[PDB]
Structure 1
């Protein structure tokens, strides 16, 4: 018939010693689940660890390149740069500006309405000798090389998206966000100058 079928004995055969009738399965196993999920929890855990690192590694596997240089110092004969002109030098992976400013330029650069600047800084706090201005030839917007002796502010201009810079290297008009970078530098004599 069917009244004749019976579920076999899974006794010691399998069942964990908290499951052998006359006493609730409940209350017992709902502790057993704990263990069986603990293994699991932990595995996800260990795996997590493993994963976190394989990614970390395989992520720095490009970020930079353990091939980084340094050259912080460069000597420049200030007489190479006569009044009115800006010379561009090869330096540390990006251009470097060194300019001889005229009476007029230095004057206009101080005459700048500082409270109205995108990046507020007075010409005199950005340079040491007012007839000498030094800048990093990289536009702050998206990285193009600003063109010296171009633009509406007698400083520079970036042909990529139209940022206008002054003789102080400050951003005035256009999209650039902050003023041109001023490197670390000092004059070792009358016609000598060192950047970095």
Structure 2
């Protein structure tokens, strides 16, 4: 038929044009997801060594410690978003590791022992499957 063929075909055309326009404008996909995996081989890092990385943006720390806030008990591996709190610097490693901007100290777990910062370093959500962190 015709009077319904025009409608069906116009709907198909509008759907294709809309798909293209949404795909161009509203789509950062497959380049936005950087990075959900965040490959962090924890078989390389030696104890009491942290790595600079990025999970959902900058930055990310990957601490590894054999023995002894504290949301998580001893797993010997985790990850913490490393940015100083009260003004936003980057603390450098080495038990505590402080940021040289003002003097804020931080335990290897993330809490603050002597605080110019008011709050600790937030635990970003993570996942460990074998020898990989998320």
Q: What range is the shorter-chain TM-score in?
A: 0.5 to 0.7
- 1:89 aligns to what? 53
Q: How does 1:156-175 map to 2 (within 5 A)?
A: 156-175=97-116
Distance 1:187 1:93 in 2: 19
**Structure with the largest fraction of strand:** 1
- Structure 2 unmatched runs, 5+: 1-27
Cα 1:80/1:169, change in 2 over 3 Å: same
1:192 aligns with 2:132: yes
- Structure 1 unmatched runs, 5+: 1-66, 108-120
**Structure with the largest fraction of helix:** 1
Shift of residue 72, structure 1, vs aligned partner: 5.0
Distance 1:91 1:157 in 2: 21
Count of equivalent residues: 103
CA contact (8 A) 2:91 2:97 kept: yes
Q: Which runs of 4+ in 1 moved over 2 A?
A: 69-72, 90-93, 127-130
Distance 2:50 2:57 in 1: 19
Q: In terms of Rg, which structure is larger?
A: 1
CA-based RMSD of the aligned residues comes to: 2.0
CA contact (8 A) 1:101 1:133 kept: no
Q: How does 1:128-167 map to 2 (within 5 A)?
A: 130-149=75-94, 154-167=95-108
Cα 1:70/1:129, change in 2 over 3 Å: farther
Distance 1:143 1:184 in 2: 20
1:77 aligns with 2:37: no
TM-score by length of 1: 0.48
User: SS at 2:43's partner residue?
Assistant: helix
- 1:176 aligns to what? 117
Cα 1:129/1:72, change in 2 over 3 Å: farther
